[model samples]
Each structure stands twice: as C-alpha cells, then as structure tokens.
Target: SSINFLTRVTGIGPSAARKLVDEGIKTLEDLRKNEDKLNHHQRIGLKYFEDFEKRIPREEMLQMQDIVLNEVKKLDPEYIATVCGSFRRGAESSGDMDVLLTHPNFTSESSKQPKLLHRVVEQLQKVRFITDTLSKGETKFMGVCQLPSENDENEYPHRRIDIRLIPKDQYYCGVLYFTGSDIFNKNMRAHALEKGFTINEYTIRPLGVTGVAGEPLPVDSEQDIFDYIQWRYREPKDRSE
Candidate 1:
C-alpha cells in the first residue's frame, strides 16, 4: 500500500517502485524529486524522502569523494582527479555527485594518453556500487551502493547511488561535465556549436571539417581543449559563474 501510494504521489512506475524499495526509501524523503530543496516535510508519504536526510551527510559525502579519488588512484598514480560542481564550490551539501579523471603521461602535461574506459570501469567495479554487478562493460557500470547521511546510526541506511565510467582519453571532457555549472556547460557547448564544432562525452572536434591530418588536433589536457577553442579554463570553484 505504501508503495502504491508512493507511486501515486511521486508518479513513479513499477520498475521505479522496485528501485525505491531496493534503495531503502520506506519513508517519504525517498520519493521527492527535490530532496535537497526540502528543508522540512510533514506529509506522511513524503517522510521516506526525508529519511535520505539520515543517510547522506556532509561527512559521508567527503568519504564518498575520497573513495572515488582512491578509485582513480588505483588506476594510476599519475592520474589527476577533481571533485567538482557544488562540492568544489563548497556548498553546504551536494546533489548526487560527479568526478573528473585524467593523468599526465608526459612532462609537457599536454601530451595525450590512451583511452582507459575499460580499465577505469574495471577498477570501479571493485569499489562495489551494488552488492552484485547487475551489469558491467568497457565504458560503464551500473549498480547500487549505500551512502551514509548526516546522522550516523548503526540502523541508519545507505542511500542508493550510482557510479559511472568514462574513458581517460576524454579526460578533459569529464572535467567539463563534473565541474559544471550546467548553464556554463550549456553555454560553452553553444559557443562551441556556433563555431562549427561538436562536443561529445569523449571529444570536442571540428564540425564538417572532416580532414584530420592523421591525428586529433592535439587535445592533451582540459586546458588544451579550452585553448584550442579559445575559451579560458575556469577552476572548479570558479564554475559558479
């Protein structure tokens, strides 16, 4: 009955209901779309969503960030990673999460490296987002993990969260995604598109200019991408603009 009412209240479907239960949202904080936006809740069904309050706290998030960074470290010591968006900007909290992954293979820093999607995803699999690997592949993994909330209680639950994978070759692209002010990303992409270029998860390339003289146009770092496009690189904390 709770699931049925929850479905009605939140407009979640059968598949989503199973996911909700699996994620441990018996209370209502589990259902609302704007969980962070909610300072308080009184409606009984919404209580489950509020329970998310108990699992994800500032400390737990820092732990998750550390864990993610360590995951990158396991891939390569030369690798660089940043916890961006609201976290880097020092918000009191964050919604979901994002991380950027890359490495310096050459002293010049702009020297390019090979793709590491499969290897990176493999390392992430070991971190155990879900108890069992529901699915795993070269560039991505989908599973469940429990993240703790603000209050630490033995009986407190783990919030269901996902860890995604991306190729190291596209490291700078990941930087753009994770360090986003969504609007900034959008504007940057728009600026890119206007310049007759295409921006994808892996690479930002020229549009309709099809002739590459055998290699990509030297995109070794996020800075390079910004430089090639003539847009200045903004530090993670600076994304608020």
Candidate 2:
C-alpha cells in the first residue's frame, strides 16, 4: 500500500506516477530506463526532478534575466519584455521565473509573423539555457531552463518558466496580473468592482446599464490600470501582499 510521492508533482499526473511506483521505479535512473512512459513535462520532471524543487538564488535569477531580455530585445527593438513574479517583487529567491512579452506588431489575432515566440525559443534552446519545452500555443509557452554549469558555480537547478505573448493593448494588465500575490489581485479586483470598473489580466472596463461590460479602456502602463479604479499605485517591489 505504498505510493511514491512523485505522484504529487505538478507535471507527472497521478496515473503515471502511480504506475511508476507500482512498478517499483524508485530511482531516477530507473525512471529514465522507461522514459517512453513520460510526456515532455514528466520527462523534465524526472530529469531535473530534484533540482526543480530547490530555490533559485536572486543572483542566478538576475543572470537568467539578462540573458533572456537581451536575446529577446535583439530580435525586436520595439518589443517589451519583463521578468515578473517574485523577481519583480524583490524576493531574494524564487521557486520559478515568469516573463511577460509584448510587441506592437504581435497581437492575439495577427498571424503575419507566427515565428516570433518560436524564434525566441529556438535561439534560447541553441544557447542551451532553455533545456526543454513542455507546451506551446498562441499565447503562452511553458518550459524548463538551467544556467551554465560553470566554474565556482553552485548547483543551479532546472527552473520552471512561463512566457506569455500578450497583446500590446493588454500588456499592462497582463503585467499587473502576473506580478501578483493572489490576495492582492483579489482585493484589487474587488475594489475595482466597488469603483464601477472591471479589471482582469486583459483589460479594464467600465460597467454599463444592468452591469453589461463596456468596451476595454485604453491603458499604456500599470499606473493606468490602477488609476481606472481610482486606487493609488504601489511600485512592483512594494506590492508583496
């Protein structure tokens, strides 16, 4: 009646992990022997299974930040890319990393250059910073990345990463949503309602008669999202609630 706790992992669902445990696949080596049983996420989970659970030091996160931003900006000077989540919140360490991406020409509907995000991923993969891809679609990419194993470096683990291709119009709202502590976003949205505005990751809008949704209001920055709801803005580093 024993089940290995890898079943509790994010990528490896109960069925696969349960099967692994039932088959006595207890070691990483054994898991690799049957790697065919794994999806990309599970494969990554087993490969960096131990490292993924460790904390990413702030210093390493910065190194990652510089690499990603520089690569992306080089591809398009007008594109805006930012590292959000705990890094933006000034945490000394983080469980994973998140980057929000936007460009003037890349929108949710535009298919003219479908290669933008794909191209970025390919370049990062060539450099070996991005180790594997879990999923990719129009708006989001989920993957794993690790730093170069260099001299005098501590064991840097494979880290979870998210890249969201946001529309330029929705960029600020997307930033506000991703750079969140959950409760703060919840409270902000609740207050947004009280102030006769509706807010989410995409855009903020005013309410019409009988609570119909109005058109999405234009916003150039995170400050505009806050301003629409009449709330004073707190810089990202100050909003850890």
Candidate 3:
C-alpha cells in the first residue's frame, strides 16, 4: 500500500493523515493547513514530486515553453501567462512543468481551439530526454523521457513523464492536482470523505444517496474549490508540506 501510495496517489506520506485533519478542512480550502507541514521530508518529497509531476524534461521543457508561448502569443498578446511548478519553480530538472495556459478573456469565449496543445507537441525537436511521445490530445500529451545522468558511461532509467494541456476552466485544479506529493493527495481524499463530500481526479462533490456516489460540481478555479469547502491557495512549490 505504501509503495502503491507513493508511486500512484502522488503526494502523501506516513504522517499526512494527521496533518490533514488538524486543519479544519474538507476540500481544497483546507489545503492551506498543508503549508504548515513543509519540512525536510516534504522538501525531499518535493524533489521527487518535481521529478514525477512533470511530463516534459529540462531541455524539452525549455523548447516546449518557448514554442507554446509563441503559439499563444500569436493567438493574443493580452494572454497573461506563466509556467508553474518545478520548471518555472527553478529546479535543475523537472518531471513536468505545469503550464497554466490561460488568457484574460479566455473564459468569455470558451470555444474549441484547433491543434493548440497538439501543435505544440508536434513542433518540438523530438530529441534527448523527451524521447518519443505516446499521444497528443486536445488538452494533454503523455510520453516517455529520461533524465540524463552525470555519468554518461552507463545506462540510466527512463523516467516516464506526462505533459498536460489544461483549458482555462480546469487550469487551477489541474495545477493543484499535478502539484502534489502522493501523500497530500491521499490526505485530501481522506479529508473529503470525512466531510461527507466525495472527491476524485475530476471533481470534489457532495456525498449523497449511496454515500459512495455524488454529483460532480463545476469548479472554475482553485478558489472555487475553497468556496465549496473553504481553503486557501497553495502554490506548487509550497505543496511539499
């Protein structure tokens, strides 16, 4: 369970259970309590999270960042943008960079944009750590990439990575979901259960009927999640806690 948790659940730890409950939270809002939990272990976990959360590599991230931004710039100069998490966050290497792809007026006209994320992936150099991509979708790209090791003489592991292209509507929660320690995610799920509100990768919803099933409420941003359960914003960097 511990191995499955660390690898699959994302941000979680041995003590994550206690830290989660101490704060008066049942959803993303209560995640603020996690800020207080950051420390050596979390920092280490963060480095790991930095490793696992990203879908692009250091060199490829740089390449894709430039390409994607250029693409967005072509769409609208007013599109205020930034890359979040380990990449923008100044890590030597990143597992995936959380590109918060959004524009100021994007929400006003939430319509289909052709070959946005797909075009970006298709344009890259397709070299080194980025390796070969698996699939490119309307909103995400998943692939395999390896972090080049200091020792070039021996073989190293190919760190499986995934890059996600999130639309404006799901951007914030995508940030929250991707920027995590496996332990933290588990804790959040547990807390949601305690609050009688069930949660999932898609949405956090009110518990009704069978107690195991509920409707997924629409959440525009991270703050909206807090409004649902009441929590504060936790930047990706601080999520190690």
Candidate 4:
C-alpha cells in the first residue's frame, strides 16, 4: 500500500516505488529516514516532497525578481528582461520563476553572442543567488536560486528559475507566450488562426491564401501582437483566464 501511494507522487513510478520498498522505505517516515540511500534519479523524485509541491508567495517572487533583474541590468543597461509565468499573471503564488531576456545585439539576423547567457548566470552566482544549475546552453538556463539570508532571519528555500535569451526581434512574442495563463494562450492562438495569422513564442506570421505561413511580422509590444490578430489587448493582471 505504501509503495502504491509512493508511486502516485510526482516523479516516482512503479519501479521507483518498488526500489524504495526493497530498501525498507515502506512508509513516508521510512522514506525520509532512508533518503540518503536514494540514487540520483530517486533523489530527484524526492524533490516532490520538498520544493516541487510548494509555491513561492508573490511577495517573495517579486523580491527575487527584483534581485535578479537588478543584477542583470548592472551587467548591461540595454539588456531587456521580464519575469513571466504565474507571477506576471498576478497569482498569489508561483510554482517557479521564468525570466526572458533580450539584447539589441541579438536578433534573428544578428550573429549569436556566445557569452551573453553565461555572463548573466555568472553574475548571479557571484551574488550567491544561483545555488545549482540543472542544465545550460547558449540560449537557455534552468537552475535553482535562493535569496541571501537576512541578518535577522534564516535563508530562503531553493527555488527553480529558468532564463532564456531571445533574439531582440522576437522578444515581445516570447514575453507574451511566457506570461500566459495557458488557457488564455490557447484561446489567443485559436483566434489568431481564425484571423489568417499564426502566432507562437517566436513571432506572428500571416497565413497565405494556400494556408502557408508568411514571413515573421515585426512585434514591438504585447499590444502589437494583439493588434496583429485583431484581438483586444489584455494586461497581465487580467490574463488569469
């Protein structure tokens, strides 16, 4: 029964639960007691009981956002950044932070800046905000971060963070996509299709008479994306649906 229950948890499966049971971890208490015995994959599964199930309060999300954005701005005043996801939709709490970045030097037509994402990540590490890196590439980073301990308080829990470096021309579309309430995105995309346009995180393009996609349209803001599809503009706070 305990194995059955364990299998229902986020990352655990039948095999993983059986492994835990074989190791004498037949209950929640036993699992905790034997946590250190878990292998890499099983350990990651255990995160469901730790950070994965918890939500960061909007206030804390905002604070972390400010810290991250301020640090990135210090690196390059011209770098544009926004913290998207539930935080942007005015949720009382968020599962994680999603930050999208763009710089004038990076565009669809421009060559890649191999060091841009790393420079920002290194700066965050310098301030001790970034705690662990899960994966990284020239365009994206997934990691954990924590706010510094206040003089009067304990340190914050590690929280997941994802940063993506988008081309300058596609920045607004990226922002609009990441700032979504998923249902809103689905509806918006459906509407775009009806309007002879196709929209995605990268860009919005017009559909041809034969239903083929045309060249990417220039998008300067979220409102421009709405205008392209003839949909009314909606603010982040109003996007819950």
Clashes of each: 18, 0, 19, 0
CA lDDT scores, all candidates in order: 0.55, 0.82, 0.53, 0.83
Tens-digit per-residue lDDT, 26-115, candidate 1: 445454553443223222224334433443556666877777677778778876666656666666665445555444442223433334
In candidate 2, which residue pairs clash?
none
Ranking by lDDT: 4, 2, 1, 3
Off by over 4 Å in 3: 1-67, 76-92, 96-114, 123-134, 137-139, 143-161, 166-168
Q: Which candidate number maximizes lDDT? A: 4
Worst 10 residues of 2 by lDDT: 1-10
Better of 2 and 4 by TM-score: 2
lDDT of 4 by residue, 132-219 (tens): 6766778998777887877764647668888999999999999999898899899899999999999998999999976689999999
Model 2, span 96-128: residue lDDT tens: 989898888876566645476777887889888
- Badly placed stretches (over 4 Å) of model 4 are 1-49, 151-155
The 10-residue segment of model 3 with minimum total lDDT is 1-10
At residue 156, give the lDDT of candidate 3. 39
RMSD from true fold, candidate 2: 2.5
lDDT of candidate 3 vs native?
0.53
- Whole-model lDDT, model 2: 0.82
**Would you estimate the TM-scores of all the predictions?**
0.57, 0.88, 0.49, 0.82
